[PDB]
Design an enzyme around this catalytic site. Structure first.
Site, PDB file in Angstrom:
ATOM      1  N   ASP A  53       4.197 -15.594 -13.747  1.00 38.38           N
ATOM      2  CA  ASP A  53       3.820 -16.356 -14.934  1.00 38.38           C
ATOM      3  C   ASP A  53       3.856 -17.855 -14.656  1.00 38.38           C
ATOM      4  O   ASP A  53       4.252 -18.650 -15.484  1.00 38.38           O
ATOM      5  CB  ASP A  53       4.698 -16.024 -16.135  1.00 38.38           C
ATOM      6  CG  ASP A  53       4.159 -16.460 -17.425  1.00 38.38           C
ATOM      7  OD1 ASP A  53       2.967 -16.810 -17.542  1.00 38.38           O
ATOM      8  OD2 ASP A  53       4.945 -16.577 -18.435  1.00 38.38           O
ATOM      9  N   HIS A  98       0.960 -18.045 -19.044  1.00 34.24           N
ATOM     10  CA  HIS A  98       0.589 -17.548 -20.366  1.00 34.24           C
ATOM     11  C   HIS A  98       0.242 -18.668 -21.317  1.00 34.24           C
ATOM     12  O   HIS A  98      -0.337 -18.374 -22.368  1.00 34.24           O
ATOM     13  CB  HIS A  98       1.682 -16.674 -20.981  1.00 34.24           C
ATOM     14  CG  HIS A  98       2.932 -17.365 -21.493  1.00 34.24           C
ATOM     15  ND1 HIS A  98       4.103 -17.476 -20.757  1.00 34.24           N
ATOM     16  CD2 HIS A  98       3.185 -17.881 -22.708  1.00 34.24           C
ATOM     17  CE1 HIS A  98       5.025 -18.015 -21.524  1.00 34.24           C
ATOM     18  NE2 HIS A  98       4.489 -18.303 -22.690  1.00 34.24           N
ATOM     19  N   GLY A 103       7.241 -22.464 -28.186  1.00 37.44           N
ATOM     20  CA  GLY A 103       6.563 -23.652 -27.780  1.00 37.44           C
ATOM     21  C   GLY A 103       7.213 -24.447 -26.665  1.00 37.44           C
ATOM     22  O   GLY A 103       6.783 -25.561 -26.334  1.00 37.44           O
ATOM     23  N   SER A 144       8.132 -22.919 -23.587  1.00 40.52           N
ATOM     24  CA  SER A 144       7.865 -22.391 -22.243  1.00 40.52           C
ATOM     25  C   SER A 144       7.329 -23.523 -21.381  1.00 40.52           C
ATOM     26  O   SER A 144       6.633 -24.417 -21.853  1.00 40.52           O
ATOM     27  CB  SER A 144       6.868 -21.255 -22.279  1.00 40.52           C
ATOM     28  OG  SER A 144       5.582 -21.631 -22.662  1.00 40.52           O
TER      29      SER A 144
HETATM   30  C1  LIG Z   1      -1.536 -13.762 -19.807  1.00 44.21           C
HETATM   31  O1  LIG Z   1      -0.867 -13.585 -18.599  1.00 44.21           O
HETATM   32  C2  LIG Z   1       0.507 -13.492 -18.445  1.00 44.21           C
HETATM   33  C3  LIG Z   1       1.266 -13.338 -17.228  1.00 44.21           C
HETATM   34  C4  LIG Z   1       2.671 -13.209 -17.145  1.00 44.21           C
HETATM   35  C5  LIG Z   1       3.411 -13.259 -18.459  1.00 44.21           C
HETATM   36  N1  LIG Z   1       4.753 -13.069 -18.349  1.00 44.21           N
HETATM   37  C6  LIG Z   1       5.486 -13.067 -19.519  1.00 44.21           C
HETATM   38  C7  LIG Z   1       6.965 -12.965 -19.401  1.00 44.21           C
HETATM   39  C8  LIG Z   1       4.765 -13.237 -20.745  1.00 44.21           C
HETATM   40  O2  LIG Z   1       5.517 -13.158 -21.860  1.00 44.21           O
HETATM   41  C9  LIG Z   1       4.960 -13.468 -23.130  1.00 44.21           C
HETATM   42  C10 LIG Z   1       5.007 -15.021 -23.308  1.00 44.21           C
HETATM   43  C11 LIG Z   1       6.512 -15.285 -23.557  1.00 44.21           C
HETATM   44  C12 LIG Z   1       6.736 -16.373 -24.547  1.00 44.21           C
HETATM   45  O3  LIG Z   1       6.477 -16.414 -25.728  1.00 44.21           O
HETATM   46  N2  LIG Z   1       7.365 -17.500 -23.930  1.00 44.21           N
HETATM   47  C13 LIG Z   1       7.973 -18.509 -24.690  1.00 44.21           C
HETATM   48  C14 LIG Z   1       7.168 -19.551 -25.358  1.00 44.21           C
HETATM   49  O4  LIG Z   1       7.690 -20.470 -26.016  1.00 44.21           O
HETATM   50  N3  LIG Z   1       5.799 -19.463 -25.195  1.00 44.21           N
HETATM   51  S1  LIG Z   1       4.981 -20.569 -25.918  1.00 44.21           S
HETATM   52  O5  LIG Z   1       5.083 -21.875 -25.385  1.00 44.21           O
HETATM   53  O6  LIG Z   1       5.180 -20.520 -27.394  1.00 44.21           O
HETATM   54  C15 LIG Z   1       3.318 -20.071 -25.680  1.00 44.21           C
HETATM   55  C16 LIG Z   1       2.943 -18.702 -26.201  1.00 44.21           C
HETATM   56  C17 LIG Z   1       2.590 -20.665 -24.479  1.00 44.21           C
HETATM   57  C18 LIG Z   1       2.349 -21.221 -25.852  1.00 44.21           C
HETATM   58  C19 LIG Z   1       9.404 -18.949 -24.247  1.00 44.21           C
HETATM   59  C20 LIG Z   1       9.278 -18.037 -25.396  1.00 44.21           C
HETATM   60  C21 LIG Z   1       9.700 -18.519 -26.797  1.00 44.21           C
HETATM   61  C22 LIG Z   1       9.792 -17.685 -27.842  1.00 44.21           C
HETATM   62  C23 LIG Z   1       9.709 -16.177 -27.702  1.00 44.21           C
HETATM   63  C24 LIG Z   1       8.819 -15.650 -28.810  1.00 44.21           C
HETATM   64  C25 LIG Z   1       8.507 -14.137 -28.879  1.00 44.21           C
HETATM   65  C26 LIG Z   1       7.989 -13.513 -27.560  1.00 44.21           C
HETATM   66  C27 LIG Z   1       9.100 -12.925 -26.717  1.00 44.21           C
HETATM   67  C28 LIG Z   1       8.686 -12.559 -25.286  1.00 44.21           C
HETATM   68  N4  LIG Z   1       9.788 -12.022 -24.595  1.00 44.21           N
HETATM   69  C29 LIG Z   1       9.650 -11.379 -23.390  1.00 44.21           C
HETATM   70  O7  LIG Z   1       8.569 -11.161 -22.890  1.00 44.21           O
HETATM   71  O8  LIG Z   1      10.858 -11.110 -22.864  1.00 44.21           O
HETATM   72  C30 LIG Z   1      10.989 -10.802 -21.448  1.00 44.21           C
HETATM   73  C31 LIG Z   1      10.815  -9.127 -21.532  1.00 44.21           C
HETATM   74  C32 LIG Z   1      12.135  -8.764 -21.707  1.00 44.21           C
HETATM   75  C33 LIG Z   1      12.896  -9.668 -20.698  1.00 44.21           C
HETATM   76  C34 LIG Z   1      12.158 -11.108 -20.843  1.00 44.21           C
HETATM   77  F1  LIG Z   1      11.846 -11.625 -19.602  1.00 44.21           F
HETATM   78  C35 LIG Z   1       8.309 -13.894 -24.608  1.00 44.21           C
HETATM   79  O9  LIG Z   1       9.073 -14.823 -24.514  1.00 44.21           O
HETATM   80  N5  LIG Z   1       6.998 -14.031 -24.118  1.00 44.21           N
HETATM   81  C36 LIG Z   1       5.868 -12.884 -24.074  1.00 44.21           C
HETATM   82  N6  LIG Z   1       3.434 -13.363 -20.846  1.00 44.21           N
HETATM   83  C37 LIG Z   1       2.692 -13.334 -19.639  1.00 44.21           C
HETATM   84  C38 LIG Z   1       1.229 -13.464 -19.719  1.00 44.21           C
END
Ligand SMILES: COc1ccc2nc(C)c(O[C@@H]3C[C@H]4C(=O)N[C@]5(C(=O)NS(=O)(=O)C6(C)CC6)C[C@H]5/C=C\CCCCC[C@H](NC(=O)O[C@@H]5CCC[C@H]5F)C(=O)N4C3)nc2c1
Ligand SMILES: [Zn+2]
Length: 197
Positions: free
Chosen positions: A101, A77, A157, A159
């Protein structure tokens, strides 16, 4: 024409690192914004890479990447299908699995890999892009609870960064976070057993 005007998607670029080699974790920036954007477009990064945990950016997002088993892993993602900039030009992914992911490129020359954890510990440590080290209690294979309430922004930020055991081995890479009323409560990670080709 329409096709002449088609823009090329750029590369992921290493813009810094999280140093974990001493008694103190800390973030280092290795490229500023203009240099990031230029290196994304060319795919050519002549900086010398060091360490295990990189800070990475695309044209639009910034996150982390972690070397384990000789592959630099991050989240789909953040990186999508993009190449990574390298001293020899853009490098195509060697692993792509949207269903986890998860993406990977051969680890850069000069980097080092974390060792996979074989401890079975439930005391984990999440490393953020600000080099904060956050205790996490493992709940099963891919999840953990945060001991202390932090605003979710403290984790945004980060991940692609590691979850470490007490000995500093890699248990997984940070994927997603669960919050209640804005307070981060739990994390979801890609387990290290999957961080191998
Ligand atoms: C497009 O193709 C795909 C394929 C597979 C795929 N798979 C997942 C899981 C996925 O999720 C998206 C991205 C991930 C995210 O933001 N990741 C972090 C981050 O920091 N990203 S990041 O670096 O800012 C960024 C965005 C890269 C620059 C670590 C968090 C930090 C803060 C959270 C903020 C609020 C969001 C809360 C969400 N929560 C959630 O989904 O909870 C799940 C559901 C319930 C159980 C648990 F597992 C969450 O975290 N998400 C939602 N997107 C995809 C997309
Ligand atoms: Zn361990």
């Amino acid at each position: 024409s329409h096709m002449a005007s088609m823009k090329k998607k750029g590369s992921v670029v290493i813009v810094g690192r999280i140093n974990l080699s001493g008694d103190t974790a800390y973030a280092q920036q290795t490229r500023g914004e203009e240099g990031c954007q230029e290196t994304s477009q060319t795919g050519r990064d002549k900086n010398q890479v060091e360490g295990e945990v990189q800070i990475v950016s695309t044209a639009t997002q910034t996150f982390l990447a972690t070397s384990i088993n000789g592959v630099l892993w991050t989240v789909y993602h953040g990186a999508g299908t993009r190449t990574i900039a390298s001293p020899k030009g853009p490098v195509t992914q060697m692993y792509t699995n949207v269903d986890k992911d998860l993406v990977g490129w051969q680890a850069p020359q000069g980097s080092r890999s974390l060792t996979p954890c074989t401890c079975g510990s439930s005391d984990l440590y999440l490393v953020t892009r600000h080099a904060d080290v956050i205790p996490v209690r493992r709940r099963g294979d891919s999840r953990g609870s945060l001991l202390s309430p932090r605003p979710i922004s403290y984790l945004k930020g980060s991940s692609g960064g590691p979850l470490l055991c007490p000995a500093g081995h890699a248990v997984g890479i940070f994927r997603a976070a669960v919050s209640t009323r804005g307070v981060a409560k739990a994390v979801d990670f890609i387990p290290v057993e999957s961080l191998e080709t």
